[PDB]
Design a protein around this nucleic acid. Structure first.
Lengths: 96, 50, 79, 100, 106, 93, 82, 93, 111
DNA sequence: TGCCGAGGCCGCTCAATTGGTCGTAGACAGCTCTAGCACCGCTTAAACGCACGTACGCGCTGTCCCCCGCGTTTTAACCGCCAAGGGGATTACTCCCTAGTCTCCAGGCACGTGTCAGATATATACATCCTGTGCATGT
DNA sequence: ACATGCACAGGATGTATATATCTGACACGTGCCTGGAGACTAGGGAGTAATCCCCTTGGCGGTTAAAACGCGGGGGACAGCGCGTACGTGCGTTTAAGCGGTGCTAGAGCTGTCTACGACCAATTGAGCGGCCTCGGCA
């Protein structure tokens, strides 16, 4: 029997259900979202990988994804993304 | 029938095209409601307001 | 004969979505050349990915990867 | 109602609003499918195509053509014309670095 | 008893999946424990953001469900999203309702 | 008039030197950088590399600006052209 | 110290760049928009270049910190290494 | 102390292979040591993405042949593939 | 045990002049994949060598026809912008101090 | 009815761009390394990719029917050509400045080095989560 | 009547925990090179002006597109065939890890020649008056 595929579907759906609880999303639009998440992920990780080599550092690091997301994202979208990354790591490093 | 409600936006958009009162995109002029803005859009527009 | 399947009104519609008010009659047979070279460039790459993958059906991924490579990404076919 | 055909070259704007609002794909599927198959055989004979992949080529083409025409519109309006001509496409396709 | 790194970080996005992919994609020989958390937060933020615009666009267009038009409208209205997505095309997305001003009647 | 302009073009296409003065350009690079962070040092090579990118970008823009002007049948370039050549290439809108 | 040093991109130098680009006549409005376009280009390159230097925990921008900004902006530059 | 690790001597040796009279200014050497390195990053990056797009842990002559077949333009592709296949043939004996 | 005097470089076994060893070392150390098969650096070295032969053959012919005997960035820019193949490989690059391909747009010419 | 002017054409004069000759020092070769550090041979090892299958899904290859594509003529909006005006870009000129050379200063910093510790990859068993699925239901 | 949303089962994945080991944060010495400022120089640029010629404009006339007309073809619509594509397996060739040996690629050195770089000359090429005739109007 053919194996399971992989997608962000339940997470993006859950994210919709914490910003427009009243609203649904079409499977066509899910196909776009699942593509967009994979593309932004492949940009950030792919460009972070170059920072690791430019610095001759072996570890992909929160200290440095923070650079990639201010390189890729423009303007205030960068600043607010860096904020959410900062808050997330602040919770995680408090909880451990 | 109810299809007249979908046609009425275009009927108004045509009356506004005779008048030439349309915006820099040629659309009907439509109002802002600032509750529709994200926190980031609010920050950008509050910076545009300074 | 196949490119003439890109009908006169099909080009007019694409142009109309593109916002151009008035179309010179020379546009159709020139634009068929531009669509042709665009398709030819994405198909060369897509068929190259599919050949590499040993398969002989061009998959949605074969064309999505070619389009991603040419810097004309599309979302919806499972990027 | 009142204008109908008023200033011939104005049902034109009614078509702009129709085809710019809506999300049909503006080329007929079977003609476009015959085009991609009869192109691809020049480089590899006896290819199959996934039935969505041909649509993925179509949606890339219509996006590319729409973008090209929007850029062509600028070239005509800059050159004091409301009518596009091949020489506009030659400018647009040159400046994006694709042709020369 | 387990607890997910997602909920521990205060995220809906799958931190474990992000950590898996950051190794499995060859992006470097080692991945720091904070990196997938921080990256998952940025994916989550952008996904919430692009949906918040699209939801408002869908609701303004009187529809109970987001479909690709509402995504294309969202992506092309906010110039920071448009500047991020200047090299993408949206399946059945259409385009912004732009008429160039010179083409309008006087 | 109009002949010596073509002679300037022949001259400045034959030679490969920097067309912008080093000191003004070096000050400009600093005076821009000094609001992302204060007190950067620029390695002497890096200011040259910015200048090579800048002059090549400007020449590569005036190139397509020329094509815009000649498409509009006039010969003189105008802000109208630079706005087009950017607007159509993708740096704005 | 700091100032609006952009006017140091002097009118004859823009005429030289334009003349290397082969444009025969320059309308006088061009110069003050050209400075805008150049400043926007340097802002966009230097924004990235400084963040590479920030990330390296340096205070000195090397030629690599600019070449890498130029690579990712799709304007690759041979002749400074890497 | 330190090392730079450069292509400089190989491109010099290849120049002397095709034009035994000719030399390289170190500025042009810097161009070449950029160019061959940029092409290497493109081809390795493309072969990598292609191998990931087939979920293979390896990259081999067929992956990198395919990367070259994508990434080069017209006749440079079929000539380069001819030289790559000559080399791998003459190596594997 | 014991090993062969001048046990030959992968380049010289291939008959190449580019450094097959360095290419293999770079392909692993840049982390392009967890495994890099023994043919890949040979084939890649041959391609880099062939492109290097192609571009220098043009650059030296351009430099000689410009009456010089040493390549300078100018001659590389004249080769790269003359050749319709390399120009579309190299559409997104600036050659430092290379100048530009000399042209007047045809409409600007007198008479 | 004998002449001379308007018009065409020839000859030498003359001042701009071009290819060429000279010499000095910048920057290439051509070193010898020396020296050290990659690269390679010889191993043994695990695993990944290959070769053989077969089952099942997805694509080829043929069927009906209304809408869109085509070809039609009409006519009007528009583009292309044009004359004429006058704003502004060129070209030349003078004087001032600030760009470049260069020198010497002294500090701020990149870097290499050595230490060492806490960070992460390895492996393992446990457990809970996400995918695929049946079917209720809402657009 | 379909496209989406919720409940059920299960298998593959994430987390807790143990465990070893090496990345890189760190502290310091360190010498390099950058920022700095002084002093000086002349080539370059800012402001003034004449004056040319281009771009902008109003206006006309020709022709090519929008436009509505009616006709018919061909796109969008569902069956039956079969060749493929993904798992699934079992196998063998591939590549890594490992570490001593020594070939070669580098930095810095010395040291040197020589290319080619400015500056200076000697053409060829351009456009131009001084001299002679007739075609053409005429006393």
């Amino acid at each position: 029997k053919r194996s399971r595929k992989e997608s962000y579907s339940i997470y993006v759906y859950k994210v919709l259900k914490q910003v427009h609880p009243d609203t649904g999303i079409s499977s066509k639009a899910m196909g776009i979202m699942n593509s967009f998440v994979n593309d932004i992920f492949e940009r950030i990780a792919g460009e972070a990988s170059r920072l690791a080599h430019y610095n001759k550092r072996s570890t992909i690091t929160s200290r440095e994804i923070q650079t990639a997301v201010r390189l890729l994202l423009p303007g205030e979208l960068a600043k607010h993304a860096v904020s959410e990354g900062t808050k997330a790591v602040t919770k995680y490093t408090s909880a451990k | 029938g109810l299809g007249g409600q979908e046609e009425e936006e275009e009927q108004r958009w045509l009356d506004a095209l005779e008048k030439g009162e349309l915006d820099d995109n040629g659309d009907l002029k439509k109002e802002i409601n600032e509750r529709l803005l994200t926190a980031r859009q609010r920050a950008l527009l509050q910076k545009a307001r300074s | 004969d196949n490119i003439q399947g890109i009908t006169k009104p099909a080009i007019r519609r694409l142009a109309r979505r593109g916002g151009v008010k008035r179309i010179s009659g020379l546009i159709y047979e020139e634009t068929r050349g531009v669509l042709k070279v665009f398709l030819e460039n994405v198909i060369r790459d897509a068929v190259t990915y599919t050949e590499h993958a040993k398969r002989k059906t061009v998959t949605a991924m074969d064309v999505v990867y070619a389009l991603k490579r040419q810097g004309r990404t599309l979302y919806g076919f499972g990027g | 109602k009142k204008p109908h055909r008023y200033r011939p070259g104005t049902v034109a704007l009614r078509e702009i609003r129709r085809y710019q609002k809506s999300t049909e794909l503006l080329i007929r599927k079977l003609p476009f499918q015959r085009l991609v198959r009869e192109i691809a055989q020049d480089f590899k004979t006896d290819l199959r195509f996934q039935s969505s992949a041909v649509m993925a080529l179509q949606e890339a083409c219509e996006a590319y053509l729409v973008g090209l025409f929007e850029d062509t519109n600028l070239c005509a309006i800059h050159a004091k014309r409301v009518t596009i001509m091949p020489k506009d496409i030659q400018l647009a396709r040159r400046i994006r670095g694709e042709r020369a | 008893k387990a607890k997910t790194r997602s909920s521990r970080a205060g995220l809906q996005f799958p931190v474990g999946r992000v950590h898996r992919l950051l190794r499995k994609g060859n992006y470097s020989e080692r991945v720091g424990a904070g990196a997938p958390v921080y990256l998952a937060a940025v994916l989550e933020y952008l996904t919430a953001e692009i949906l918040e615009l699209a939801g408002n666009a869908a609701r303004d267009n009187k529809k109970t469900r987001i479909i690709p038009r509402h995504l294309q409208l969202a992506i092309r209205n906010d110039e920071e999203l448009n500047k991020l997505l200047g090299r993408v095309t949206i399946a059945q997305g259409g385009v912004l309702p732009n008429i160039q001003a010179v083409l309008l009647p006087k």
